Design a protein around this ligand. Structure first.
Ligand SMILES: Nc1ncnc2c1ncn2[C@@H]1O[C@H](CSCC[C@H](N)C(=O)O)[C@@H](O)[C@H]1O
Ligand SMILES: Nc1ncnc2c1ncn2[C@@H]1O[C@H](CSCC[C@H](N)C(=O)O)[C@@H](O)[C@H]1O
Lengths: 196, 195
């Protein structure tokens, strides 16, 4: 559940600064995925579960209009001191439904990995209501042949088969425009477009 | 550059879930690693031991072994999980700093991120860390041509037997055995340190 997960990430026994990192490496393979996507966003990007803000600051430095959303108290505060010119919102995905705010695109980089079938559905719905119609979504997650839990050092994670996740997205108002996954690893990612 | 090792320490990579922390008694890799380890008459060095799953396993079987891991979070995890086993926090190249030598080297998928411009010298450093006539057991990704391949941490590489065997011979290693199923990239081989 997000409550226990968020406090696990803000736990003083977890130094995200060193583990997650506060700056992106020039050799980071995710750059070729996120950077191109970001350029395609015509408006303010919302980095969902920005954590230490490493990608938020990186994209902001490259001229992108972007803000962050992070429920982990220690992390969001940490992100502000590290990236003083970037706006970081302290809150959860569901909190987004409490405001009329809407962004042009959504970046959820491994921020949805701790949500199972009883939680992701509602999160996707809130996300859809937080992005402009036709707006984009880039998310990375863990996939596999079955929808099942998976050990993770911070909090329990979940593997989501493409069929189940794509259906959840469609039900939520998102259409998958691209996806990628290598069966030898759970790591996977996809792009979607806000629709009906 | 410690970008690779740091990426391996990241919770996002989730080393404990992808590689594991414990060795299943039914793991098929056991029949490959154990027979080899038994042949090493001395201390084995687990190069890029990660979570220390194999290091603890072989240690519990009576094998004299130590681990080498640059990934901070992983090396610290290995130490708490196997308090009886020694784990050195360093990289293959750091081996040149110490005159220490091991009787055998186990490199289970710890060299996959090394392309044609890095593997050659990494193998030289390995040769310097093993006793003459010592043994080397390594697993890697193979294929019809030396090309890069996808991997969550960083670019990985497929090494054809010809190219890899030649790099090993140049490094002072002689391939004693090799295995590979052309259907899958997974491969492995044993080698003996020259005299
Ligand atoms: N509903 C939710 N909304 C936002 N963040 C959430 C969430 N549930 C879990 N998280 C979190 O998502 C993050 C996942 S780990 C870091 C992800 C970040 N995009 C990066 O690549 O560095 C953590 O900061 C954690 O607090
Ligand atoms: N130069 C280097 N020296 C030592 N380890 C290295 C390295 N370059 C990459 N590695 C790493 O090698 C490991 C490969 S993945 C895990 C391998 C381990 N033998 C197992 O089977 O579980 C990672 O822990 C990673 O940090």
């Amino acid at each position: 559940a997000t409550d226990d997960v968020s406090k696990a990430y803000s736990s003083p026994t977890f130094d995200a600064e060193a583990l997650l990192g506060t700056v992106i490496s020039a050799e980071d393979p995710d750059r070729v995925l996120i950077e191109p996507w970001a350029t395609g966003v015509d408006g303010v990007i919302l980095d969902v579960g920005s954590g230490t803000g490493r990608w938020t600051g990186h994209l902001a430095s490259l001229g992108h209009q972007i803000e962050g959303l992070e429920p982990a108290t220690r992390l969001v505060e940490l992100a502000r001191q590290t990236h003083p010119s970037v706006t970081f919102h302290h809150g959860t995905i569901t909190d987004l439904s409490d405001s009329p705010k809407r962004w042009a695109g959504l970046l959820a980089w491994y921020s949805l990995i701790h949500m199972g079938p009883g939680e992701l559905p509602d999160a996707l719905v809130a996300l859809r209501m937080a992005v402009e119609d036709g707006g984009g979504l880039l998310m990375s997650f863990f996939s596999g042949p079955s929808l099942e839990p998976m050990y993770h050092p911070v909090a329990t994670a979940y593997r989501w088969p493409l069929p189940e996740l794509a259906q959840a997205l469609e039900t939520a108002g998102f259409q998958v425009t691209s996806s990628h996954w290598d069966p030898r690893f759970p790591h996977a990612y996809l792009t979607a477009e806000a629709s009906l």
